[PDB]
């Protein structure tokens, strides 16, 4: 089963999603979005908590599925601490790149998921001895998912900066860890 980090992230995302249905998306975004006014710049959690907000059922389900699988595997093979660091780095950097391109009104775990995809794949490719890899069918499924975001094949406005920065981060960390 899912280890403690994999689990607490899933619980966190569900709690926030429930709060968003009860209070409305806008109210939760006031608390958890990337700082959108200079007065919020020291509210450190905001540089990460954008990753916990989801706006559609499809969005939360697919992100949590990928997180459960790829996060669960990273945590099992390489430890909880590794998953925590991938998560913090991808959330922070994906958010930074997103806000730079399109401003602070974004959310979702997909920056982190795209990091895990690139991480697990490249680490398996460059360092088979790690005991982690992305199997063929999931390479294809991950590629289609990526392609769909890039070419806007969901009926939703995408955080393309978050997604590409996420993937970059995962590939970069795999490269670093495979030395």
């Amino acid at each position: 089963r899912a280890g403690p980090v994999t689990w607490v992230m899933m619980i966190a995302c569900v709690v926030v999603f429930i709060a968003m249905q009860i209070l409305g998306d806008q109210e939760v975004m006031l608390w958890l979005a990337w700082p959108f006014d200079p007065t919020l710049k020291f509210e450190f959690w905001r540089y990460f908590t954008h990753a916990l907000m989801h706006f559609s059922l499809m969005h939360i389900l697919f992100n949590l599925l990928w997180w459960w699988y790829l996060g669960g595997a990273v945590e099992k093979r390489l430890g909880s601490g590794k998953l925590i660091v991938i998560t913090l780095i991808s959330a922070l950097l994906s958010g930074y790149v997103q806000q730079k391109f399109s401003g602070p009104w974004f959310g979702g775990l997909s920056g982190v998921v795209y990091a895990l995809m690139g991480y697990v794949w490249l680490r398996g490719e460059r360092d088979p001895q790690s005991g982690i890899y992305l199997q063929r069918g999931l390479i294809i499924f991950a590629l289609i998912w990526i392609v769909a975001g890039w070419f806007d094949l969901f009926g939703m406005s995408m955080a393309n900066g978050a997604h590409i920065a996420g993937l970059a981060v995962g590939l970069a960390m795999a490269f670093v860890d495979s030395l």
Partner: peptide, 5 residues
């Protein structure tokens, strides 16, 4: 409206 990651 909002962008989805």
């Amino acid at each position: 409206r909002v962008r989805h990651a």
